[PDB]
Amino acid sequence: GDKKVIQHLNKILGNELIAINQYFLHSRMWNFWGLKRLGAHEYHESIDEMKHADKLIERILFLEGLPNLQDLGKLLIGENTQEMLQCDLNLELKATKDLREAIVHCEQVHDYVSRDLLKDILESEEEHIDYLETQLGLIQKVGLENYLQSHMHE
Amino acid sequence: KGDKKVIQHLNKILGNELIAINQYFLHSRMWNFWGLKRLGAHEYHESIDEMKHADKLIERILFLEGLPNLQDLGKLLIGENTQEMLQCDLNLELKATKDLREAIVHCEQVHDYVSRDLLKDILESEEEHIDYLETQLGLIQKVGLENYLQSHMHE
Amino acid sequence: GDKKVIQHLNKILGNELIAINQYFLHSRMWNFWGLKRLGAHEYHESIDEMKHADKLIERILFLEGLPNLQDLGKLLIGENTQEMLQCDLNLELKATKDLREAIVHCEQVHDYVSRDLLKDILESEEEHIDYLETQLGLIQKVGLENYLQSHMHE
Amino acid sequence: GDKKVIQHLNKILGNELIAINQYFLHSRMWNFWGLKRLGAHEYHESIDEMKHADKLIERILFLEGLPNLQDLGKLLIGENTQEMLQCDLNLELKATKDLREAIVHCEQVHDYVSRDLLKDILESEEEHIDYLETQLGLIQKVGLENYLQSHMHE
Amino acid sequence: KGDKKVIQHLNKILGNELIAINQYFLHSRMWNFWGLKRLGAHEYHESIDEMKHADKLIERILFLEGLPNLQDLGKLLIGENTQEMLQCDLNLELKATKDLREAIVHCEQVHDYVSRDLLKDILESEEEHIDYLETQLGLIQKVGLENYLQSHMHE
Amino acid sequence: GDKKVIQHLNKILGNELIAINQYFLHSRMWNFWGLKRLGAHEYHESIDEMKHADKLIERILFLEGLPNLQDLGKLLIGENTQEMLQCDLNLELKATKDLREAIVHCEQVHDYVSRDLLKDILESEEEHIDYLETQLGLIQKVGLENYLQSHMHE
Amino acid sequence: GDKKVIQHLNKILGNELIAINQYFLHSRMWNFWGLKRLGAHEYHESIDEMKHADKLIERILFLEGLPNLQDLGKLLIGENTQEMLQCDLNLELKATKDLREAIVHCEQVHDYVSRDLLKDILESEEEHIDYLETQLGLIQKVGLENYLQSHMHE
Ligand code: HEM
Ligand code: HEM
Ligand code: HEM
Ligand SMILES: [Fe+2]
Ligand SMILES: [Fe+2]
Ligand SMILES: [Fe+2]
Ligand SMILES: [Fe+2]
Ligand SMILES: [Fe+2]
Ligand SMILES: [Fe+2]
Ligand SMILES: [Fe+2]
Ligand SMILES: [Fe+2]
Ligand SMILES: [Fe+2]
Ligand SMILES: [Fe+2]
Ligand SMILES: [Fe+2]
Ligand SMILES: [Fe+2]
Ligand SMILES: [Fe+2]
Ligand SMILES: [Fe+2]
Ligand SMILES: [Fe+2]
Ligand SMILES: [Fe+2]
Ligand SMILES: [Fe+2]
Ligand SMILES: [Fe+2]
Ligand SMILES: [Fe+2]
Ligand SMILES: [Fe+2]
Ligand SMILES: [Fe+2]
Ligand SMILES: [Fe+2]
Ligand SMILES: [Fe+2]
Ligand SMILES: [Fe+2]
Ligand SMILES: [Fe+2]
Ligand SMILES: [Fe+2]
Ligand SMILES: [Fe+2]
Ligand SMILES: [Fe+2]
Ligand SMILES: [Fe+2]
Ligand SMILES: [Fe+2]
Ligand SMILES: [Fe+2]
Ligand SMILES: [Fe+2]
Ligand SMILES: [Fe+2]
Ligand SMILES: [Fe+2]
Ligand SMILES: [Fe+2]
Ligand SMILES: [Fe+2]
Ligand SMILES: [Fe+2]
Ligand SMILES: [Fe+2]
Ligand SMILES: [Fe+2]
Ligand SMILES: [Fe+2]
Ligand SMILES: [Fe+2]
Ligand SMILES: [Fe+2]
Ligand SMILES: [K+]
Ligand SMILES: [K+]
């Protein structure tokens, strides 16, 4: 197992761990406000990050590294829907940047299996970016209050 | 026999339920009359819940050899629009949970642990209703009154 | 809506609310005593009164009146089976007298829909009277202890 | 068959015939405009009036009168949703006034079967008035645009 | 590892369960022998209920690293006719609920909230049993003994 | 009903009552240690003794004796698996010796129905002896740790 | 919501969050080693703590407090089965100590619903303690290699 790939994998894992907690708190904030459609979708984003974390832990162990679940970076918590969506988007853009750098390194040392795992995680992060950007655009097109109204009921 | 002051408390809680039954049922039918059928149906289910709480209170009172008091009906808090009605229900529930907390203190003090457990089950349900009410009031502010009513027209 | 019909309807509603609470207490007393068949039949009487009140509240609102659920008249509570049944029978006879007077006024002002609602309620209150007098008569024909024995188990 | 009862029934029938055409045209206007939920409900109001007419026709023939499907009174056609609902409401209020006078006459000559038919029709017309007043009320509470938005899709 | 006095209370409750098990089983089989099969069946199910309580107490005592006492059997209260047997069961239950209340107080004092919740569940069941017994005794007075027994011949 | 048969039946019943409690405690001990296969089997042994006690009680009542559920003899409680199994085995050998004397006495006074009941219970105790002796022999053949390992999981 | 109760709830939440990561890493270490039955049971312990965490966050938000998902305390990671089980046990004993103190405070300020939630979590934690002490006892009774052998396959 290449020491620097393992480092990259733990960096990605650290980003997942941030996103699990940020999205889960955002989910329960929306549910508490009665915006249950947003809350449910955000919950599923949290679950996806949990599964990404699982696969990174498994790969790190296989490569004989030490998965780092101890270091938890800064959660970006908003206080209304629009800030929450933008905080999620900022966290995702950072995450895809780290994924690109880790893929470069995997290719360099010929760890093609790790690359393929990171590429699958990256496809899903870009789908998340697409979702978040689409929501911010909808808020502009239909208005904030209409947008929130359409995310009250599941 | 039951402790006389526990029975007193239980009859106080029962009196609160009886207010809530009538207040929520009328509010339900006002919302249905207005064509706000989603609010009406939810409020109907709140009224049903209080009916079931009253039933369990009546049964416990009788087991404790008290006289259940269904004669004294306190003051209903009837609003005339959706905002007032939600706030009236919230005001009733806040008083209701305060009385439930005092009743639980007294059950614990005389070691009536079954009655305490009944009252805690009712209390958890009242706190869920408070959560529902504060959420609806909060949503009115976020989405606008007219949008909120619109969303509660159709089941 | 005619103001005097609304008053009449609120008077019928007031009787229903007495009956609801009287029958519900009587039901739970019989249950507490282990007379579960009596308790169960009295429960369904209470439910029937609940359903009458519902229809009255709906009609009052449509006629642009204010349903009165605040005023609760005197419950007639008995302390044994024979008294409870007679208390219920007394309440029903008062209720049918009020219903007839309301039907007369509905007819006079041509509120035929309210009349028809009150007539449906009146048929149901006559069936309850029939039930009650029948129970009172069975107590005489089979004896009190036998009558109670036969209403122990559902 | 009493001549004046039959004349009353033919009057009620004439009101039904106006209502059939007015509600059907209003339904198809709303469908044309893409307000398909309003259109579907107005269609069902039209169908109900068709069934009332059918029953009145059968009764008139049994009483050996001549059902009058030739005279069509004035259709009250609105140009927008508010006017259209109010036009229906004005038609219904006229229909219920005529129904009450017909019921009076049925009672006075002891045609109790014709009375009961007219009362069943009256119960349905007061439900329709309830519908119409509720919709005009919702336009006030939720705003016209929102109300129309909520009745686009079935 | 569990609290010594909680364990002693739990063993005391268990001893009460072991008396009820045997007392209710014997009464059940006496009623069956006499052809009062409805009373025999209900009394059997009361005995089974006590067996399940005993089981939960034994498991909890072991988890707390105490020694379940199944050796000491106190006095069965056996009646010789239906009215005595119901009253003996009732007298046993009233003793059992007094002891349950004292054990719950001790659990609360030392913060053994899980043992308290178990005892509260048992107490709920014993008050349901007290309700059954007082109701049967009240029915003997209301319908007469002979009618009462008649109604409990067939299942 | 012969007084000495009844004494014999109460003696067997007294043995069943010891066994019920001894086996139930041993079952829950094994369950608590996580030897859930030993614990489940011992639970079923306790259940069987409960069913023997039931049949004995019914027989004693029919013979117009008084069933003695009051006097509970000494439970033999071991502190590890090998002792617990040997304690059960010692209890069973005492029980079968008492059964044999009870059957002799039933045969002598021609209580053939009681004898046949005792023979059925005796058949079941000898199956329990077989189980216990078999478990003790398996401990010698496969070793204690393997024997316990094989009875962790149901 | 009482500020000190919210502090207690956030402290319990903080313990849940340690347990999530510690149990999930331990689960995946056991799966990596081929001890898949140990890994699967540890995964379900991790899921349980995720659910507790969820209930705490919902209650804190309802009490109008701020759930703290940012502070992650120290994971106790073992390097073999016996150390990992003991690290989970040490974490659980600390968690039940904090739960008892939080329940005391809920009682004192009459927040009986929060107490009931904490009591439910506490019952689950005591079941986890029972599992953990049972596994440690079994290692002693059947020996380590036997115990690990029995937890290779699911
Ligand atoms: C002392 C007062 C009352 C008590 C104790 C009581 C109790 C109950 C109970 C136990 C039920 C069955 C709930 C279930 O398990 O689903 C019920 C049903 C119902 N109650 Fe009440 N109730 C009371 C007053 C009222 C009032 C004042 C109204 C209306 C104005 C009402 C309307 C209804 C209706 C419509 C149902 C459903 C009936 C059906 O369709 O089956 N109740 N009530
Ligand atoms: C320490 C005392 C006892 C304990 C802990 C105990 C425990 C149990 C348990 C847990 C059950 C299962 C009930 C269920 O879940 O449905 C049971 C069943 C039963 N018990 Fe006991 N019991 C005890 C004493 C007795 C005694 C003394 C008798 C009779 C004299 C008895 C007769 C029965 C019978 C007939 C059953 C049903 C068995 C079947 O499935 O056929 N038990 N017992
Ligand atoms: C190390 C961090 C975490 C990891 C690796 C992780 C992993 C997982 C996995 C693999 C699942 C199953 C998903 C599926 O396949 O459907 C899951 C479920 C779940 N997680 Fe997490 N999780 C973590 C943190 C959290 C946190 C911090 C919370 C809440 C505050 C949480 C809440 C949940 C919930 C509610 C479920 C669904 C469980 C159920 O009800 O079945 N997770 N987690
Ligand atoms: Fe909520
Ligand atoms: Fe991810
Ligand atoms: Fe790199
Ligand atoms: Fe792949
Ligand atoms: Fe993501
Ligand atoms: Fe959406
Ligand atoms: Fe809603
Ligand atoms: Fe309506
Ligand atoms: Fe309530
Ligand atoms: Fe008090
Ligand atoms: Fe409970
Ligand atoms: Fe409530
Ligand atoms: Fe009862
Ligand atoms: Fe009625
Ligand atoms: Fe009048
Ligand atoms: Fe009708
Ligand atoms: Fe009635
Ligand atoms: Fe019975
Ligand atoms: Fe079209
Ligand atoms: Fe019509
Ligand atoms: Fe006329
Ligand atoms: Fe008819
Ligand atoms: Fe119409
Ligand atoms: Fe609509
Ligand atoms: Fe469309
Ligand atoms: Fe028999
Ligand atoms: Fe018990
Ligand atoms: Fe104590
Ligand atoms: Fe519990
Ligand atoms: Fe009991
Ligand atoms: Fe265990
Ligand atoms: Fe046996
Ligand atoms: Fe002998
Ligand atoms: Fe045989
Ligand atoms: Fe045996
Ligand atoms: Fe295992
Ligand atoms: Fe693997
Ligand atoms: Fe937990
Ligand atoms: Fe504190
Ligand atoms: Fe709860
Ligand atoms: Fe735990
Ligand atoms: Fe394998
Ligand atoms: K809108
Ligand atoms: K082996």
Q: Is residue G77 left, alpha or beta, with left meaning phi > 0 and alpha meaning psi from -120 to 50? A: beta
- Judged by its nearest atom, the ligand closest to the C-alpha of residue F55 is 2
Q: Is C62 on the interface with D (CB under 8 A)?
A: yes
Length of chain C: 154
Among A98, A82, A97, CA closest to A132 = A82
Asked if G9 and G56 touch (Cβ cutoff 8 Å), the reply is yes
Neighbours of ion ligand 4 (CB under 5 A): B 131
Method used to solve the structure: X-ray
Non-local (6+) Cβ contacts of F31 within 8 A are: E59, F39, F40
Non-local (6+) Cβ contacts of A137 within 8 A are: none
- Nearest chain C CA: its distance from D111 CA (Å): 16
Radius of gyration over every alpha carbon of chain A, rounded to an integer in angstroms: 17
Whole-number Å distance, alpha carbon A32 to ligand 4 midpoint, is: 5
Q: Which two tokens stand for residue D152?
A: 């686009």
Non-local (6+) Cβ contacts of G145 within 8 A are: none
Breaks in chain E, after residue numbers (C to N greater than 2.5 Å): none
Radius of gyration over every alpha carbon of chain G, rounded to an integer in angstroms: 17
Closest ligand 1 atom number to CA of residue B26: 30
- Nearest chain E CA: its distance from F58 CA (Å): 7
- The amino acid that residue D48 corresponds to is D
Among B79, B102, B98, B97, CA closest to B89 = B79
Of B105, B127, B131, the CB nearest to G110: B105
The alpha carbon torsion through G30, G36, G38, G39 (nearest 10 deg) reads 60
Within 6 A (CB) of ligand 1 lie: B 18, 21-22, 25, 48, 51-52, 54-55, 70; C 17, 20-21, 24, 47, 50-51, 53-54, 57
Of B111, B114, B117, the CB nearest to E105: B111
The answer to whether B76 contacts C70, with C-beta atoms less than 8 Å apart, is: yes
Radius of gyration over every alpha carbon of chain E, rounded to an integer in angstroms: 17
- Nearest chain G CA: its distance from E46 CA (Å): 27
In chain E, the residue whose alpha carbon lies closest to the alpha carbon of B2 is E127
Of D135, D137, D142, the CB nearest to B146: D142
In chain B, the residue whose alpha carbon lies closest to the alpha carbon of E119 is B113
Total domain count, chain E = 1
Phi and psi for B66 in degrees, rounded to 5? Answer: -95, 175
Among E62, B99, B59, CA closest to C25 = B59
Task: DSSP for C15-80, please give it.
Answer: HHHHHHHHHHHHHHHHHHTT-HHHHHHHHHHHHHHHHHHHHHHHHHHHTT-----S--------SS
DSSP B125: H
Alpha-carbon span A17 to C78, nearest angstrom: 67
Of A34, A149, A153, the CB nearest to B138: A34
Full residue range of the structural domain in which residue D84 is found: 1-154
Within 6 A (CB) of ligand 2 lie: E 18, 21-22, 25, 48, 51-52, 54-55, 70; F 17, 20-21, 24, 47, 50-51, 53-54, 57
Q: Where are the alpha helices (DSSP H) in E34-81?
A: 37-63
Whole-number Å distance, alpha carbon D135 to ligand 11 midpoint, is: 10
**3-class DSSP state for residue A151?**
coil
Task: Consult the annotation and say whether B102 binds a ligand.
Answer: no
Alpha-carbon span D146 to B154, nearest angstrom: 13
**3-class DSSP state for residue F114?**
helix
Phi and psi for C70 in degrees, rounded to 5? Answer: -85, -40
The answer to whether G69 contacts A31, with C-beta atoms less than 8 Å apart, is: no
Alpha-carbon span D110 to D116, nearest angstrom: 11
Q: Which residues of E are annotated as a binding site for Fe(2+)?
A: 17, 50, 53, 93, 126, 129
Which residues of chain B does C76 touch, with a Cβ-Cβ cutoff of 8 Å? none
Among E124, E82, C7, G152, CA closest to B56 = E124
Asked if A56 and A7 touch (Cβ cutoff 8 Å), the reply is no
Handedness of CA G89, G107, E111, B6 (dihedral sign): negative
Non-local (6+) Cβ contacts of G112 within 8 A are: B101, B104, B120, B123, G106
Resolution (A): 2.2
The CATH number of residue D52's host domain is: 1.20.1260.10
Alpha-carbon span C85 to C23, nearest angstrom: 10
Asked if E60 and E52 touch (Cβ cutoff 8 Å), the reply is no
